Design a protein around this motif. Structure first.
Motif, short mmCIF file in Angstrom:
data_model
loop_
_atom_site.label_atom_id
_atom_site.label_comp_id
_atom_site.label_asym_id
_atom_site.label_seq_id
_atom_site.Cartn_x
_atom_site.Cartn_y
_atom_site.Cartn_z
N UNK A 20 -4.09 7.88 -2.44
CA UNK A 20 -4.09 7.37 -1.07
C UNK A 20 -4.23 5.86 -1.05
N UNK A 21 -5.12 5.31 -1.88
CA UNK A 21 -5.30 3.86 -1.94
C UNK A 21 -4.02 3.20 -2.41
N UNK A 22 -3.35 3.78 -3.40
CA UNK A 22 -2.15 3.15 -3.92
C UNK A 22 -0.97 3.26 -2.96
N UNK A 23 -0.93 4.31 -2.14
CA UNK A 23 0.14 4.40 -1.15
C UNK A 23 -0.17 3.59 0.11
#
Length: 49
Positions: A20-23
């Motif tokens: 989620x953080x990377x997206x």
DNA sequence: GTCGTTAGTTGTGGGACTAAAGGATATCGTGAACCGAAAAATTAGTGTAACGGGTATCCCACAACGCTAG
């Protein structure tokens, strides 16, 4: 069983948080107004009426 | 009857799996003999003392007066 679930099913939570953080990393408030006439309709959330 | 096509398997291969601390390991099997290389140790060979003037420096002590007459 509860202790095993606690000790083994947080790696999935960490993986989900990482993905989620990377997206979502690049999503930053960059301007003030996007000059849009579009939106979403919000109403009350009813479960079992 | 025969050949290319498409979709749905089916088997197979490549890629993920919180965060913090810590963080010690044990590691077989043997064939001979001679030559070359360089790194190391052992051995063989030569030696001063005071003097002349003259002068640079040192330590060490002392001086650097006061009065009377022609």
């Amino acid at each position: 069983k509860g202790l095993a679930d606690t000790a083994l099913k947080t790696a999935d939570a960490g993986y989900l948080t990482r993905r989620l953080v990377d997206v979502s990393q690049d999503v930053i408030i960059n301007t003030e107004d996007c000059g849009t006439l579009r939106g979403i309709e919000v109403e009350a959330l009813k479960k079992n009426e």
